[PDB]
Amino acid sequence: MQRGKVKWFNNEKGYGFIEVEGGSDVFVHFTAIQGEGFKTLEEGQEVSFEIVQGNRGPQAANVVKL
Amino acid sequence: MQRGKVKWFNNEKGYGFIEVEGGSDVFVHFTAIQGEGFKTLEEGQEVSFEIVQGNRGPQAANVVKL
C-alpha cells in the first residue's frame, strides 16, 4: 500500500498518473478507481424511467440509459 | 414506465430534463440515474493504492480517494 496525490488525469483517454513522494509516478487506468462514479446524462441520451411526484413537481425515478 | 431523450443535463447543478414525445419535460436529479457512474480522479486528490505489474510496467490497483 502506498499514499500519493493525483498528478494529472485525462477523462478522454481514461488514465493518468499518481505522484508519490520520493518515488516514480504511478500510472492509473480508470478501471482501478474505487468508489461510486459520477452520475450524469448526455444531451440526446435515450432513457427509460418511472414518473413519481415530489413536493416540487414530477420527476424521474429509475433512469436507465438505453 | 416511459421512454424519453435527455434534453439537457447540467453537471454543476446535478440535474436536467428529459423530453418525452407529446408531454412535458420530466425533471431528473442525478441520484435517480442507474448504472455505474463515470470513474475519474481529480488533480491533487490524495489516494491510497497497491502496485501491480502489467505487461507495460507498474500501475496502480485498488485506488481509493482519501
Add this chain to the structure above:
DNA sequence: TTTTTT
C-alpha cells in the same frame, strides 16, 4: 453534481 428549464 444534492432537487423543477436551458
Add this chain to the structure above:
DNA sequence: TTTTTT
C-alpha cells in the same frame, strides 16, 4: 474514459 507523462 479502455492502458504509461500534462
